[PDB]
Amino acid sequence: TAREQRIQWFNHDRFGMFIHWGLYAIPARGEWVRSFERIPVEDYEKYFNSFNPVNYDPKAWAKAAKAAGMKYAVMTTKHHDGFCLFDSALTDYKATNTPAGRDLIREYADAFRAEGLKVGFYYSIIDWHHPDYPAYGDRQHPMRDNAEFKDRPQDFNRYLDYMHGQVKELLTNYGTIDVLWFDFSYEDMTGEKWKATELVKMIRELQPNVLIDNRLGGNIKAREPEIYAGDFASPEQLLPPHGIVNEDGKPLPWEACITLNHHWGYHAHDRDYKTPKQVVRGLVECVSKNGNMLLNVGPNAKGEIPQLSLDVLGEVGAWMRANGDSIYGCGAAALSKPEWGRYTQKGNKLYAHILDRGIGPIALQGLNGRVKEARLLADGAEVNIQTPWNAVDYPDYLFVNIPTAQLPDDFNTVIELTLED
Amino acid sequence: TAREQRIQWFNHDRFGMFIHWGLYAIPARGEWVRSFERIPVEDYEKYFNSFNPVNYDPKAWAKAAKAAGMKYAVMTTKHHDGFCLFDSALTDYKATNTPAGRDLIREYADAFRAEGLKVGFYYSIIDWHHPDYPAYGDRQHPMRDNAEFKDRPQDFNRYLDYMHGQVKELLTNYGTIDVLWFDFSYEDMTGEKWKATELVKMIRELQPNVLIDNRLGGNIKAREPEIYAGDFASPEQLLPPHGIVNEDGKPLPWEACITLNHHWGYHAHDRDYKTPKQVVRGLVECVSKNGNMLLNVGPNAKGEIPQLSLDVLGEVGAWMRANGDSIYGCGAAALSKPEWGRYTQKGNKLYAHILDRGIGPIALQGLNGRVKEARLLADGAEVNIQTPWNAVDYPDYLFVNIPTAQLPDDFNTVIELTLED
Amino acid sequence: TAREQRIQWFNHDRFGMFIHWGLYAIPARGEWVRSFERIPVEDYEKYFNSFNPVNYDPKAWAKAAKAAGMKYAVMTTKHHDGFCLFDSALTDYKATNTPAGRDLIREYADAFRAEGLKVGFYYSIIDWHHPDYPAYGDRQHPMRDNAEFKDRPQDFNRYLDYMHGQVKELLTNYGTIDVLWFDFSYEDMTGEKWKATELVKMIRELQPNVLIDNRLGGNIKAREPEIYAGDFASPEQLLPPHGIVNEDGKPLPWEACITLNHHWGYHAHDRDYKTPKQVVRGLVECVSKNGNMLLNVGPNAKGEIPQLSLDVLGEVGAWMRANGDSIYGCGAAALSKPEWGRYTQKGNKLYAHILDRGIGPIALQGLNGRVKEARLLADGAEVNIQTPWNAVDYPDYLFVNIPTAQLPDDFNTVIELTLED
Ligand SMILES: OC[C@H]1O[C@H](O[C@H]2[C@H](O)[C@@H](O)[C@@H](O)O[C@@H]2CO)[C@H](O)[C@@H](O)[C@@H]1O
Ligand SMILES: OC[C@H]1O[C@H](O[C@H]2[C@H](O)[C@@H](O)[C@@H](O)O[C@@H]2CO)[C@H](O)[C@@H](O)[C@@H]1O
Ligand SMILES: OC[C@H]1O[C@H](O[C@H]2[C@H](O)[C@@H](O)[C@@H](O)O[C@@H]2CO)[C@H](O)[C@@H](O)[C@@H]1O
Ligand SMILES: OC[C@H]1O[C@H](O)[C@H](O)[C@@H](O)[C@@H]1O
Ligand SMILES: OC[C@H]1O[C@H](O)[C@H](O)[C@@H](O)[C@@H]1O
Ligand SMILES: OC[C@H]1O[C@H](O)[C@H](O)[C@@H](O)[C@@H]1O
Ligand code: NA
Ligand code: NA
């Protein structure tokens, strides 16, 4: 019941902003740059010492997210590079010791909270800076192939204490936190290796309603999962072909995390953006399969969401002002996907998402005499659903009649169907 | 055997041009105008007297059609209004007696034959001009409610001699004809009322290989149908939700006849055209369901294919030049329609028609291990069909990786999959 | 004087087309694909077996080239992968044994020569197919790291027979060849390893006027260049900061070879194309430094120059139609590069290439009293070169006055200045 209760807002809200920001925004080629260029800590220091986000305005970020129709955010407090954007009492490697001279995470949390957005923190359990985190031979440590680190003396338990402490700070010093998005478990760096059981007990004594993703280890699909296996699953850079279900076939909460371009952190030459049309359609696809979408922005080193990112969000937002009822509080319908688009549903309201006008009337299989009313969501206008003369040979189908050659909305034209009961 | 042999070219070719043209291009408000405005013959004579197409160049027409990827054409030799565009020996109400002084059908037939298109003739079995065709009480004769025409002299046998005679002329005086498209039976005006059996015996005596539509009455869906039931079915202003089959579920040749705007004949104020994207996706749909598409143009009173119609056809043609292998000679795959578009197939070539890029790799159900090569049809380029890292939880899918945020072709990006065996 | 005489056409003509085509158009991610993916010959065979360009029309290629203002071409007869596009008697790995069954180089040579363009052949002295070319341990051979190839029996002399044979075929079987573009020498695979002296002596017995590039090894900048050092230098994917000179500071003939996108071979997802404006400016820059530009196209597997390449070439051509006098037969002026653009020169015609209108009148340092007439090259109109009232304090300058805020031509507005003798 507690599990079911704390996840309600999340399932209802459907659409979030991911935010990846850090020192990596200066090299501006990806958050993994220490790893793929094997950059030791001394060489990353020039980014630490020059990080000065003079145009950082998270109230403008939050207004952008809200206007986009997003209901929650998740921001990187510390990525794999170990740099804390928050004012930790446990390290010096944090934004308050850069020219930023401030807690960037407090500004984020206050701005998003004040717009009515739920406040999420991302926290990398990987740490390429902490000297006790394993390095020589690790799958992706920057110094994984540097023999100067082989058999260097380490106590992983100190890293864990550090990590457990930082999580405590995040859940004590920033008000109410709706999501903790850990990242990620791999090979033997999974489960109890993090003291995950203990981590999660501590978390639920501090903020019992917080939602955790499924990256600490374990198996969220098990009927009786471990305590750290997560409240929701997190497919990445794809939309599952089917909603994610557990081993009994029960729907699990899930959220697809998706980049706007191809990159999480700011990438100075990646302008290969998704269109607002694809963003809308992906959100609708996630909802149509009982899931959420977490759409990422990577702000530049000056602390700006890139203009192309904002242009996309503004148009998505225009669509959501008209069509949001078919997203918020909605889920999958018990019908196969139709030829012409997708369905989402909320009680006795079945939303037909017309992605492809086709030619002539639109055929909704299995719904003849199950629909009491049909209305265009965007304007509340009646849609004619009488079988036209040229379609009388197809009585298993309901027909929607659109008298224009093109749809009124090319992103997605939504028809609200009120089902008989 | 005879039935299968003669339809082969038609099933192969898939894509043709309907041409509605005649006196009704002057009132320019639809070919039913006499009917719906109850115009007597004397009032419509003004169109007969002023019909003089200054710019009728059926060689231009044929080049536009060929360029569009159309393989065949069907032109109106006489419509419901009874005006004949060919030089009939059986009436004076023909194009050679207008100021045009030409046999427009001869010109059409020659010009299209010259470009290598198959030549089809449409003949209205309804006639609102012939004195022996039923008028008073008719479902749609112009004079149906004019009681001054109740009890007018009538020998319907003379209309049948006229009709059977004109079809004999079309099939003797104009070389090899590939399609005869009759239109249409209604109420008691059906089947043997037309002497359909003697008509078709006459037709097959003269040109045994001609294809006939299914509007003479009859039931083409019957296990052994009437001899006049037709070679192909003719759904209209809709693309059937499923391919047309007979009672046993055997697939029938069929063809969807579709307007470019809302009108068959030229409508001077109808600029609500389908886009080239829509046309390409309509044809693909038809082929995916074992069917043809016959797309209409309605020339204006001067003999011109309207410029908006030529614009559409020009772009359709650019697509067909790159992608016609996925159309010509193809039909249905034995696979459900996939989420992202549609399949068409030819031997071991399965064509994936990507109509929505979605987000992430494109998931093809049931095809892992079943595909040997994948290539973009438009340029011959190799496509990567390796399961990406973020998709390993879905082993019953084949994944197509597209490295750009948008498809190369927004109409329809086609992927030629070479199947194993 | 042999050397000077045969290079004059090259220096005069300035602008050429590079064409990279072969089996690598299919995998469509660069001609180095065997090397960067360590592909063995057996897995590349799928491309040999499916190579059948449906739309290879080198007459169309040549018209495109001619209309761009290009005067010569150079085409890959055989790239690093060893596949020959010409009907060699010395190998079976050639285009007449693919489904194409064509000598692609013969058609190229005939098409270009008929349009009046000089005909160039590019030939890779590197060969990743020939069994005697060094593989294990080679800098870039596909099997360079494959243990199976270590210490297998090889005789490099057989590769030199093959290669010298193939060069003799190119120079005997295809008429007059104006350019031979060899590629490339590296580490120990340089100079007399190729038997380059014998190669060049043979070349010059067969076609004494052929121009050769500088990639067989040795030093074209030397005072005493080897016989195989070349007639022209070949900087790549940049425009050198100053014209190429030898050790005595004498100008050498040079050509910058430049891709239209980022790739030589066809790349199916690289649309990052240079604009016509950059193409013009780069040609101008090359000429302004006494060099040539060789601009590359990478045709697709069907043998089409990509649409986007053709768009750039046609807009370049339109500029060359008006302004080509400032390119052909032109070279460097003895002046520093001006603030507003660049100079080219031909006899007493000094062409000022206005790349940047600035604000107000344009200052040409050092030319006050040295210019008789000024004309706009495109329309032959006069240009006012009187010192304006607001510019009398600057008498070491000639001023060009443009009465409009913007230039007539944004690519480059060329003023022809006739010099006082
Ligand atoms: O092709 C000759 C002629 O055709 C049309 O002329 C019409 C005219 O507009 C009507 O008012 C009436 O007189 O019938 C004519 C046809 O005989 C075109 O309008 C005209 O441009 C053209 O010369
Ligand atoms: O199925 C193997 C087949 O591939 C090619 O056939 C093409 C044909 O060239 C096109 O005109 C169109 O019909 O699509 C076909 C399927 O790809 C080869 O040309 C042919 O040799 C081979 O049998
Ligand atoms: O020009 C002949 C033919 O070439 C291409 O056919 C390819 C086909 O796409 C591949 O799957 C494989 O079968 O090799 C064929 C060539 O041998 C074009 O795709 C096709 O349109 C064309 O007719
Ligand atoms: O979900 C996106 C996250 O996971 C990615 O796979 C990387 O670890 C990190 O760059 C990012 O924060
Ligand atoms: O196929 C379209 C045909 O049928 C239509 O229903 C009408 O009879 C006529 O306008 C047209 O020729
Ligand atoms: O000049 C360009 C040539 O050199 C390039 O560096 C590659 O070797 C080859 O793709 C090309 O033919
Ligand atoms: Na209207
Ligand atoms: Na790229």
Instruction: DSSP for A115-137, please give it.
Output: TT-EEEEEEES--SSSTTS--TT
Contacts of B334 (CB under 8 A, 6+ apart): none
Asked whether B347 lines ligand 2 (CB < 6 A), one says yes
> CB B26: neighbour CB atoms within 10 A?
20
Asked whether B375 lines ligand 2 (CB < 6 A), one says no
Q: Do B238 and A397 touch (CB under 8 A)?
A: no
Instruction: Give the integer Cα–Cα distance in Å for A199 and A159.
Output: 13
Q: By three-state DSSP, how is residue A152 classified?
A: coil
Asked whether A257 lines ligand 4 (CB < 6 A), one says yes
Contacts of C20 (CB under 8 A, 6+ apart): C31, C76, C79, C122, C264, C265, C266, C296, C297, C298
> CB A146: neighbour CB atoms within 10 A?
14
Q: By three-state DSSP, how is residue C72 classified?
A: strand
Parent domain of C116: 5-328
Q: How far is the CA of C308 from the centre of ligand 8 (A)?
A: 17
State whether A311 and A375 are in the same domain. Answer: no
Q: Do B358 and A281 touch (CB under 8 A)?
A: yes
Q: Structurally, how many domains does chain A consist of?
A: 2
State whether B16 and B133 are in the same domain. Answer: yes
Beta strands in C79-171 (DSSP E): 118-124
Collect all residues of chain B within an 8 Å Cβ-Cβ radius of residue C50: 373, 375
Asked whether C258 lines ligand 6 (CB < 6 A), one says no
DSSP-derived secondary structure for B147-212: GGGTT----HHHHHHHHHHHHHHHTTSSS---EEEEE--BTTBSGGGGTHHHHHHHHHHH-TT-EE
Whole-number Cα distances in Å, B84 to A355, B91, B122, B168:
43, 8, 11, 14
Q: Are A360 and B237 contacting, i.e. CB atoms less than 8 angstroms apart?
A: yes
List all chains that touch chain B, counting a touch as 3 or more CB pairs closer than 8 Å: A, C
Asked whether C199 lines ligand 6 (CB < 6 A), one says no
State whether A356 and A321 are in the same domain. Answer: no
- Enter the resolution in angstroms: 2.2
Collect all residues of chain B within an 8 Å Cβ-Cβ radius of residue A15: none
Of B256, B262, B358, the CB nearest to A282: B358
- Residue C211's DSSP bridge partners are C179
In C134-237, alpha helices (H): 156-172, 196-206
Max Cα distance, chain B (Å): 82
Collect all residues of chain C within an 8 Å Cβ-Cβ radius of residue B417: none
Asked whether C81 lines ligand 6 (CB < 6 A), one says no
Collect all residues of chain A within an 8 Å Cβ-Cβ radius of residue B238: 359-361, 388, 390-391
Atom index in ligand 2 nearest the CA of residue B329 equals: 13
Collect all residues of chain A within an 8 Å Cβ-Cβ radius of residue B406: 275, 278
- Residue position matching structure tokens 């438009």: B378
Q: Give the closest-approach CA distance of C268 to chain B in angstroms.
A: 6
State whether B341 and B301 are in the same domain. Answer: no
Instruction: Give the integer Cα–Cα distance in Å for A304 and C150.
Output: 55
Beta strands in C298-360 (DSSP E): 341-346, 349-354
State whether B290 and B404 are in the same domain. Answer: no
Contacts of B22 (CB under 8 A, 6+ apart): B31, B76, B78, B79, B81, B83, B85, B265
State whether A51 and A65 are in the same domain. Answer: yes
State whether A242 and A309 are in the same domain. Answer: yes
Q: How far is the CA of C264 from the centre of ligand 6 (A)?
A: 7
Instruction: Give the integer Cα–Cα distance in Å for C9 and C62.
Output: 19
State whether B74 and B163 are in the same domain. Answer: yes
Number of DSSP helices (H) and strands (E) in chain A, helices first:
10, 13
Instruction: Give the integer Cα–Cα distance in Å for B219 and B269.
Output: 38
Instruction: Give the integer Cα–Cα distance in Å for B4 and B6.
Output: 6
Max Cα distance, chain C (Å): 82
Q: Give the closest-approach CA distance of A240 to chain B in angstroms.
A: 9
Determine the residue of chain B that is closest to C47 in CA distance: B382
Residues of C with a Cβ under 8 Å from any B Cβ are 25-29, 46, 50, 53, 266, 268-269, 300-302, 304, 306
Chains A–B, number of C-beta pairs less than 8 Å apart: 91
Q: Which of A215, A238, A267 to mutate to test the interface with B (most CBs of B within 10 A)?
A: A238
State whether C334 and C309 are in the same domain. Answer: no
Q: Can you give the length of chain B in residues?
A: 421
Chains B–C, number of C-beta pairs less than 8 Å apart: 37
Q: Give the closest-approach CA distance of B282 to chain C in angstroms.
A: 26
Angle, helices B104-114 vs B58-67, to 10°: value is 40
Asked whether B115 lines ligand 2 (CB < 6 A), one says no
Instruction: Give the integer Cα–Cα distance in Å for A97 and A84.
Output: 10
Q: How far is the CA of C50 from the centre of ligand 2 (A)?
A: 10
Domain limit, last residue, from B276, B304, B328: B328
Q: By alpha-carbon position, which residue is closest to atom 6 of ligand 3?
A: C52
Atom index in ligand 6 nearest the CA of residue C265 equals: 10
What are the tokens at A364?
């909704």
Q: Which of B375, B382, B400, B420 to mutate to test the interface with C (most CBs of C within 10 A)?
A: B382
Q: Which of C304, C308, C309, C310 to mutate to test the interface with B (most CBs of B within 10 A)?
A: C304
State whether B372 and B286 are in the same domain. Answer: no
What is the DSSP secondary structure assignment for residue B312, as one 8-state letter? H
Atom index in ligand 1 nearest the CA of residue B50 equals: 14
Q: Are C121 and C168 contacting, i.e. CB atoms less than 8 angstroms apart?
A: no
In A37-155, alpha helices (H): 41-50, 58-67, 104-114
Of B373, B379, B403, the CB nearest to C302: B379
Contacts of A75 (CB under 8 A, 6+ apart): A18, A19, A21, A85, A105, A108, A120, A121, A122
Which amino acid appears at position C290 of this protein?
N
CA count, 13 A, side-chain hemisphere, C174: 30
Asked whether B235 lines ligand 5 (CB < 6 A), one says no
Residues of A with a Cβ under 8 Å from any B Cβ are 235-241, 256, 258, 261-262, 272-275, 278, 281-282, 285, 337, 339, 355-361, 363, 365, 388, 390-391, 393-394, 397, 404-406
State whether B306 and B390 are in the same domain. Answer: no
The dihedral sign for the CA sequence C397, C401, C406, C412: negative
Instruction: Give the integer Cα–Cα distance in Å for B412 and A415.
Output: 25
Instruction: Give the integer Cα–Cα distance in Å for A185 and A193.
Output: 9
- Strands B397-400 vs C72-78: parallel, antiparallel or unpaired: unpaired
Q: Do B404 and C269 touch (CB under 8 A)?
A: yes
Asked whether B258 lines ligand 5 (CB < 6 A), one says no
Q: How far is the CA of B237 from the centre of ligand 5 (A)?
A: 10
- Strands C371-376 vs C413-419: parallel, antiparallel or unpaired: antiparallel
Q: How far is the CA of C83 from the centre of ligand 6 (A)?
A: 15
What are the tokens at B155?
């020998």
Identify the CA nearest to A133 among candidates A144, A117, A145, A146.
Answer: A144
State whether B263 and B388 are in the same domain. Answer: no
Burial B132-167 (b: 16+ CB within 10 A, else e): bbbbbebeebbbbeeeebeeeebeeeebbebbeebb
Angle, helices C58-67 vs C307-323, to 10°: value is 40
In B302-341, alpha helices (H): 307-323
Residues of B with a Cβ under 8 Å from any A Cβ are 235-241, 256, 258, 261-262, 272-275, 278, 281-282, 285, 337, 339, 355-361, 363, 365, 390-391, 394, 397, 404-406
Is omega for the bond preceding C184 within 30 degrees of 0, making it cis? yes
What is the DSSP secondary structure assignment for residue C175, as one 8-state letter? S
Domain limit, last residue, from C328, C351, C381: C328
Max Cα distance, chain A (Å): 82
Domain CATH number, residue C237: 3.20.20.80
Q: Are B342 and B366 contacting, i.e. CB atoms less than 8 angstroms apart?
A: no
Q: Do C302 and B381 touch (CB under 8 A)?
A: no
Instruction: Give the integer Cα–Cα distance in Å for C68 and A387.
Output: 58
Q: By alpha-carbon position, which residue is closest to atom 22 of ligand 1?
A: B54
What are the tokens at B397?
């899918």
Domain limit, last residue, from B297, B328, B359: B328
Q: Do B379 and C46 touch (CB under 8 A)?
A: no
Identify the CA nearest to C408 among candidates C397, C399, C398, C400.
Answer: C400
CA A208 distance to own-chain centroid = 21
